[PDB]
Design a binder for this molecule. Structure first.
Ligand SMILES: [Cu+2]
Ligand SMILES: [Cu+2]
Ligand SMILES: [Cu+2]
Lengths: 72, 273
């Protein structure tokens, strides 16, 4: 069962997530994310720090980026 | 070749190591290591094929990866070897490791930019090319995202685990490999990546030279583990889908198997084990 989709503005940036097995976008740019066996998630900008959900991963990315544009 | 504790390097050894690293960077060979690691970290998954991470081959894979790097370093200065960072011992931002004559320190609060050392962006010698965002400068936030680095006691508890790995051979597994990797338990290897912060916490972690020192120690811990458990060996040993079995070959090389990398002494030794 894939997680639900989401869409919101976090720290002035638009983050979106949707089932594909799941895609995340930061200001329209896709963010590589992965699901762990235990159900937690990680993104390419925090690949050793599991967070509970895809939205948590997108928010972690925005946090890490500090305003910087994601590279495709 | 002998891999020594970074804390014990002479001023000249630090000089030659830094110079060799900077040359690999200038020549463009360095960035390829960064790319290789990112590509694998992005493809290794718990549900499918996994070679470099969250799998029994995490250890032999990074062992071979580090050997490739050390060999490249030696092609520049034959006297250079990969030092290791014992983060259980040198756990403060004050360790000699983070001095301007070695790796430089933590990044500034505004943007995490490292401002000193030979890899600071301002030197013009360390452009971040292989990246996931627009920032082209080395970034660090020592102890920012995670309070503490593993302690010796915590490391000991992991070294005590007798089983190398256990089914399902992924991030949910029990056993030595996964606890050392950090997905389960007190968390060793993963927490260190998080502690450094910056590029070290991302898929393109090799962008930070400390990446090699961190993994050289994780690699040493595997050697210490084998010493503690001579009756335990690499698993699985045959016919396991998506996972690299003992006698199967590993990507990207294809010409080497975990069985060929179990004994590190065939390639190097440590100042002390
Ligand atoms: Cu890695
Ligand atoms: Cu990934
Ligand atoms: Cu790692």
């Amino acid at each position: 069962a894939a997680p639900e989709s989401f869409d919101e503005v976090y720290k002035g940036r638009r983050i979106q997530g949707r089932p594909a097995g799941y895609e995340v976008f930061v200001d329209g740019v896709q963010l590589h994310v992965m699901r762990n066996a235990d159900g937690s998630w990680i993104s390419v900008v925090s690949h050793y720090d599991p967070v509970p959900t895809p939205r948590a991963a997108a928010r972690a990315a925005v946090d890490e980026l500090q305003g910087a544009p994601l590279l495709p | 070749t002998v891999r020594k504790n970074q804390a014990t390097l002479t001023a000249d050894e630090k000089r030659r190591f830094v110079a060799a690293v900077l040359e690999l960077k200038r020549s463009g060979r360095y960035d390829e290591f960064v790319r290789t690691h990112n590509e694998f970290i992005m493809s290794d998954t718990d549900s499918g094929e996994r070679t470099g991470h969250r799998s029994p081959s995490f250890l032999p894979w990074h062992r071979r990866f580090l050997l490739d790097f050390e060999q490249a370093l030696q092609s520049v200065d034959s006297s250079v070897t990969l030092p290791y960072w014992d983060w259980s011992a040198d756990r403060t931002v004050r360790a000699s490791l983070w001095a301007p004559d070695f790796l430089g320190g933590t990044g500034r609060s505004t943007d995490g930019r490292v401002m000193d050392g030979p890899f600071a962006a301002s030197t013009g010698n360390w452009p971040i090319n292989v990246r996931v965002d627009s920032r082209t400068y080395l970034r660090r936030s020592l102890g920012g995202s995670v309070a503490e680095l593993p302690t010796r006691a915590e490391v000991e508890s992991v070294l005590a685990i007798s089983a190398y790995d256990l089914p399902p051979y992924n991030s949910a597994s029990e056993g030595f490999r996964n606890h050392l990797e950090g997905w389960r338990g007190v968390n060793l290897h993963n927490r260190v990546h998080v502690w450094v912060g910056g590029q070290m916490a991302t898929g393109v972690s090799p962008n930070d030279p400390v990446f090699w020192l961190h993994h050289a120690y994780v690699d040493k811990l595997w050697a210490e583990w084998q010493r503690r458990h001579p009756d335990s060996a690499y698993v699985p040993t045959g016919g396991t889908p998506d996972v690299v079995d003992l006698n199967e070959t590993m990507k990207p090389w294809n010409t080497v198997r975990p069985a060929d990398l179990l004994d590190h002494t065939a390639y190097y030794t440590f100042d002390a084990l």
